[PDB]
Design a protein around this nucleic acid. Structure first.
Lengths: 338, 176, 102, 141
RNA sequence: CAGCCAGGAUGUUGGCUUAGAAGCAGCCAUCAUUUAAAGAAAGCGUAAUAGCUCACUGGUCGAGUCGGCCUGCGCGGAAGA
């Protein structure tokens, strides 16, 4: 129930330690063995999954962090302690981009795994390691190689198998007033929403029907009361995608003759991402007549050019959604990921 | 300073007994007695009270105005009384009064029994309302604070014990 | 008292779709358990609910369970009532273990 | 013009038939029906003309219906079809886009039935120009 | 002077290469009547109608009050076995 956000942070990989050059007196002993050991290997920033949070402000509040430099070698052949690896917790579904090779090292799907984004450097070599008789005086110093300069660009994509997008006040936010437990601030006035809402559906024994929401817009690059354009970002990861159509508005846009435009904003972004499956399910039938409804549904579905099976339920009153629940659940069990 | 020079008027029926630096405001609604640092002398003039400092100490008017201020609380408390109202916001929050023991249900693992002081009377007009009545503003303020300190209103939803006049701010932080 | 609780537990589990119910009698074979009842669970969510169900009727029936095992893993889980011990198991996971050999 | 009960006003014009994309059903939702546009809203507007947006107040206390009185249209919608340009400035102040004159817009501002600030006439003739000259116009006083 | 009791408005939801903006990251002149005073502007801050306060004016007690600098002597800066 709070405003979405995303940003990027500046993280510098830990650089390796430096070799140590040291000579020592002992009591009345002028000349002794070379003193000074290795340095400290640089830190390794890690990415931990976050299931028990959804916040991203911890990236604007703290933008620059430095992994501790590997401590220089000390006397008495004391090597430098490895810099502690700082773990940056990240919410699930954050694809990472780099300045340069703008390809993702790996998408974050499960909870409880760690991914390396910047390996630490290499420790230096002290003069003790360089003991020899060719020089007969080990005093040269070998500095540690700096860690890799990786810059992270973070965008969040929510994990949900089913997502809601549709016309204003058409029931996209009302869809969660179903058997789901989430209750976003939904009504019957323009756009009903600013923040995406997520809800779960318990069916039977580990079968899940997490529902995603996005606030759509009008005719693409247009808006009614300042609603943003870049809200398709949280979508585009749903294996099953549903769409709602405004039915008999008091003064709103006409029937499916306007839905020819609705085809466009799916492919507007780049390509609709290989034309993910789309089912045209209707809503708000409780205030209409079913005997009046079949002639519209026979006309709405076919005027656009869609001939597949159309689902006709009233999500406003939360009745008849069960057959969708079984059928969609049937889709996953009959079509796993491959 | 100018507060000390401002006279305070006492209504009829409230006796003032001066025995040096101890002053009694016994009247219609109880008995109150306080002591000073001896830095202010009170003058028994006509039906009002005036205050003044003495030479030798630098504080002077600073504490002189206080004695006028504190006595203002006592005179009203013995003829009108101070009323403090507190309300419970949230599900599972219950308050009740039995004798001089105040019982509260704030989601803890056990009901909390709070003992009131000598000069405070508390009542519950409804299930989620507490009203405090007393003769001294000093005691009623601490008791009202003491009830508030148990479940201080957390900003996010305001669930807890709050003052009636105090307003709680609801803010959206830690998005999602 | 054993027969009464045996009836009390077999009825409750069947009320929430508990299939493949077999009541064993290990009297004499072993000196730890009096009666043995076995159950089948399809997957993790509902078998935990069965464990949640039986433990909360036990608290409402007076008898306090003295030990449970299933934590962060629903392949096996046990709820104990003293004389009678219930074993709710996954169907796929049971076949690795024995059935009516205890 | 008394108190709370949240007077609201939303219109874009009276010529058409209450379109949603510009305003929507936001013309009242606390006891005001949306279908009342063709019974009392179109009671005196249809008798004269439909070419000017008009503000409306709700004034509903406990009744199913409404008890307001219509008033004058705003002073900015009169610069489209009766005085000049229909779109606007374009460039705000890079040059002088539009032009107005004293001879223009003298009787149009007097068509207001009852919306006055004082009884003086010449005081209000230079009050109507407040809307103008704020968008990069020229005065021909 | 600060308190307390009231006002805080009219074009005006100011139009504008304004994707919504009715005071707010853009946009401009920064003007124009009624009045005792009120800004196309002070803010906590909603997708906005919004909720409320303030810049100034009036009344109330009535004689001091308002906000800048120099300077001796004082406090913090000043934690180790």
């Amino acid at each position: 129930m709070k405003f979405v956000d995303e940003a990027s942070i500046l993280v510098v990989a830990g650089d390796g330690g430096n070799g140590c050059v040291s000579f020592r007196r002992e009591k009345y002993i002028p000349k002794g063995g070379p003193d000074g050991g290795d340095g400290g290997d640089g830190g390794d920033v890690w990415m931990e999954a976050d299931e028990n949070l959804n916040t991203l402000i911890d990236y604007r509040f703290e933008k620059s962090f430095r992994a501790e430099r590997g401590q220089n070698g000390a006397s008495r052949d004391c090597t430098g302690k490895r810099g502690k690896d700082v773990t940056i917790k990240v919410p699930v579904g954050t694809r990472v981009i780099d300045q340069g090779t703008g390809e993702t090292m790996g998408d974050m799907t499960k909870h409880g795994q760690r991914l390396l984004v910047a390996k630490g450097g290499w420790h230096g070599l002290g003069n003790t390691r360089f003991k020899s008789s060719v020089n007969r005086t080990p005093r040269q110093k070998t500095n540690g190689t700096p860690g890799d300069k990786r810059e992270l660009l973070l965008e969040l994509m929510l994990l949900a198998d089913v997502g809601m997008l549709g016309m204003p006040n058409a029931g996209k936010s009302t869809f969660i007033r179903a058997v789901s437990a989430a209750k976003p601030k939904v009504a019957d006035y323009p756009f009903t929403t600013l923040v995406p809402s997520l809800g779960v559906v318990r069916m039977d024994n580990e079968k899940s029907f997490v529902v995603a929401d996005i606030p759509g817009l009008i005719e693409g690059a247009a808006e009614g009361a300042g609603l943003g354009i870049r809200f398709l970002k949280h979508l585009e990861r749903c294996r099953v995608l549903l769409h709602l159509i405004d039915i008999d508005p008091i003064d709103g846009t006409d029937p499916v003759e306007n839905a020819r435009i609705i085809i466009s904003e799916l492919e507007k972004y780049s390509q609709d991402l290989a034309t993910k499956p789309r089912w045209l399910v209707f809503n708000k039938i409780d205030l209409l007549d079913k005997v009046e409804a079949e002639e519209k549904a026979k006309a709405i579905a076919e005027a656009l050019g869609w001939e597949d099976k159309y689902y006709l339920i009233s999500a406003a009153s939360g009745l008849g959604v069960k057959d969708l629940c079984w059928d969609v659940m049937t889709f996953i069990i009959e079509n796993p990921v491959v | 300073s100018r507060v000390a020079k401002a006279p305070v008027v006492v209504p009829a029926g409230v006796d003032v007994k001066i025995n040096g630096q101890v002053i009694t405001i016994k009247g219609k609604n109880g008995e109150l007695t306080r002591t000073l640092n001896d830095a202010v002398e009170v003058k028994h003039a006509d039906n009002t009270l005036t205050f003044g400092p003495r030479d030798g100490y630098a504080d002077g008017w600073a504490q002189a105005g206080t004695a006028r201020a504190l006595l203002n609380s006592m005179v009203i408390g013995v003829t009108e009384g101070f009323t403090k109202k507190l309300q419970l916001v949230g599900v599972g929050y219950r308050a009740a009064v039995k004798g001089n023991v105040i019982n509260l249900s704030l989601g803890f693992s056990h009901p909390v029994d709070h003992q009131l002081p000598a000069g405070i009377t508390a009542e519950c007009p409804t299930q989620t309302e507490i009203v405090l009545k007393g003769a001294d503003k000093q005691v009623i303020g601490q008791v009202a604070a003491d009830l508030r300190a148990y479940r201080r209103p957390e900003p996010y939803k305001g669930k807890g014990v709050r003052y009636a006049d105090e307003v709680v701010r609801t803010k959206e932080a830690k998005k999602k | 008292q054993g027969k009464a609780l045996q009836d009390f537990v077999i009825d409750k589990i069947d009320d929430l779709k508990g299939q493949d119910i077999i009541a064993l009698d290990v009297q004499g074979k072993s000196s730890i358990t009096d009666c043995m009842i076995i159950c089948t669970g399809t997957s993790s969510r509902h078998v935990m609910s069965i464990a949640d169900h039986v433990v909360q009727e036990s608290r409402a029936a007076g008898l306090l369970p003295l030990g449970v095992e299933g934590e962060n893993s629903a392949d096996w889980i046990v709820v104990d009532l003293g004389d009678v011990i219930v074993h709710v198991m996954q169907e796929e996971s049971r076949r690795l273990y024995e059935l009516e050999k205890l | 013009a008394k108190k709370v009960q949240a007077y609201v006003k939303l219109q874009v014009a009276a010529g058409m038939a209450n379109p949603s994309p510009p305003v929507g059903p936001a013309l009242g939702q606390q006891g005001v029906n949306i279908m009342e546009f063709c019974k009392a809203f179109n009671a005196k507007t249809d008798s004269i003309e439909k070419g000017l947006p008009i503000p409306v107040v709700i004034t509903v206390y406990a009744d199913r219906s409404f008890t307001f009185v219509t008033k004058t249209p705003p002073a900015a919608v009169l610069l489209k079809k009766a005085a000049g340009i229909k779109s606007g400035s374009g460039k705000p102040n890079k040059d002088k886009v539009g032009k107005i004159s004293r001879a223009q817009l003298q009787e149009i501002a007097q068509t207001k039935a009852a919306d006055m600030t004082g009884a003086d006439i010449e005081a209000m003739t230079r009050s109507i120009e407040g809307t103008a000259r704020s968008m990069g116009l020229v005065v021909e006083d």
